[PDB]
Amino acid sequence: CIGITDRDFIEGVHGGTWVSATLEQDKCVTVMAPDKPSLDISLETVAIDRPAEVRKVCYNAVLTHVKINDKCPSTGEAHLAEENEGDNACKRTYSDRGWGNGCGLFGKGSIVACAKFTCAKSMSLFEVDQTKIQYVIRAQLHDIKTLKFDALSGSQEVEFIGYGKATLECQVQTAVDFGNSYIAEMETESWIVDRQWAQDLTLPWQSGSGGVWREMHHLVEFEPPHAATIRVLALGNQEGSLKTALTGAMRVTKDTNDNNLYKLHGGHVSCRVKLSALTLKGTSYKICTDKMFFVKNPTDTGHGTVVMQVKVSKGAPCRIPVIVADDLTAAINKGILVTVNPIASTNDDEVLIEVNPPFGDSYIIVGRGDSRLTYQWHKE
């Protein structure tokens, strides 16, 4: 993968040596020592295991067993047993009663209608427990070690050949704030949605400890009453509106092995590796200066950053400089570089670059001089 730098590791006169690295997915870091095999450490996955299901939202509903009870004037209020039953949606009203409908005197008469409510199609919402976030870090000598990590369980111990015992102290950083977000499951598909957005949906819902359906009236319509009948109509499937609303949302991908795991699109793990006293070797990187190509143009991550892929053909292993300025003068950088150590290991080699551009219109400038690439980006 990529090799650590001099400042990245430190060796004590006594005790151990510490390596501090930031690992991101699809990226690896390698550590090498004299008369010892090189060690490669990479971040494999960041994932969520069976997040709890907080709420169910209903976008298609069905009504059955329409029941009606009617009373004449001076006969009392009308009642139905289904009014007590939870599955039903009920309406209470008055209708015009007279000689026409079999009533002795002309007046308002009590009427009640009940219909059994069923949610044909529903959307699930899951809340992520941030202390349960899991990441897997894998280290292999040039014997493989797979280390399973938890936000709670930061420290894990491992033993390597020639390097001896080592301890990893890790922290997760995630690209999206799950305090403000839900994971929304519709059929096969899944998304990340704003919590308040989901809570404001004018559709029936059910708690995750299934209680009964709430605010059924959003998909239920009670027509104006006639003499002793009311028409109760379920509203049409609201999948179209919901799917249209979900276009501006970032998809989440279920893992391929377990398929009950959600895999986070981004975010990185900051680790400190403690080793027994060792002398390690670090490389130093030069800023690239020439010949860069856009293998993949900058594209929206969906969490407010843009990613690109670039090729370095000339000439070196070098660190790539990225800035985002609202000028072409590139005098003041207005952007933040999400990617850590965006480096080219070899010539003709592709590298990922993630950037957080300012709101409005900006220029993403990669490299320097006549050789530099530029791209124009709009952010809302």
For residue 361, give Cα distances in angstroms to 324, 326, 332: 10, 7, 14
Burial 309-344 (b: 16+ CB within 10 A, else e): ebbbeeeebbbbbbbbbeeeeeeeebbebbbebbbb
Smallest separation, CB 338 to a copy of itself (Å)? 5
Dist. CA 365–CA 301, nearest whole Å: 18
Query: Smaller CB distance to a copy of itself: residue 77 or 189?
Result: 77
Smallest separation, CB 175 to a copy of itself (Å)? 6
Smallest separation, CB 7 to a copy of itself (Å)? 3
Residue 193: both structure tokens together: 């949605």
Q: In terms of Cα–Cα distance, which of 276, 301, 306 is closest to 376?
A: 306
Query: Smaller CB distance to a copy of itself: residue 17 or 190?
Result: 17
Smallest separation, CB 200 to a copy of itself (Å)? 4
Binding region for a copy of itself (CB under 8 A) out of 40-48, 175-183, 307-315, 345-353:
175-183
Query: Smaller CB distance to a copy of itself: residue 106 or 293?
Result: 106
Dist. CA 378–CA 380, nearest whole Å: 7
DSSP secondary structure string for all residues of 161-213:
TTTEEEEEEEEE--SS-TTSEEEEEETTEEEEEEHHHHHT--S-EEESS----
Task: Tell me if residue 130 falls in helix, strand or coil.
Answer: helix
Query: Smaller CB distance to a copy of itself: residue 76 or 253?
Result: 76
CA angle at residue 143 from 137 to 148, to 5 degrees? 25
* Binds a copy of itself (CB under 8 A): choice among 20, 38, 124, 237: 20
Range 90-129, binding a copy of itself (CB under 8 A): 93-94, 96, 98, 105-108, 127, 129
Q: Note the residue count of the chain.
A: 380
Residue 217: both structure tokens together: 């009236």
Smallest separation, CB 188 to a copy of itself (Å)? 21
- Residue 330 near residue 365 (C-beta atoms within 8 A): yes
* Binds a copy of itself (CB under 8 A): choice among 1, 50, 229, 233: 50
Q: Which DSSP category does 138 fall into?
A: E
Q: Does the footprint of a copy of itself cover residue 345 (CB under 8 A)?
A: no
* Binds a copy of itself (CB under 8 A): choice among 85, 102, 146, 243: 146
Binding region for a copy of itself (CB under 8 A) out of 37-45, 59-67, 142-150, 235-243:
142-150
Range 25-44, binding a copy of itself (CB under 8 A): none
Binding region for a copy of itself (CB under 8 A) out of 1-9, 38-46, 183-191, 291-299:
1-9
Range 68-87, binding a copy of itself (CB under 8 A): 73-77, 79
Task: Tell me if residue 133 falls in helix, strand or coil.
Answer: coil
Query: Smaller CB distance to a copy of itself: residue 146 or 374?
Result: 146
DSSP secondary structure string for all residues of 240-283:
HHHHHHGGGSEE-EE-SSSSSEEE-SS-EEEEEEEESS---B--
Range 228-257, binding a copy of itself (CB under 8 A): 245
Range 268-287, binding a copy of itself (CB under 8 A): 268, 270, 272, 274-277, 279-280, 282, 284
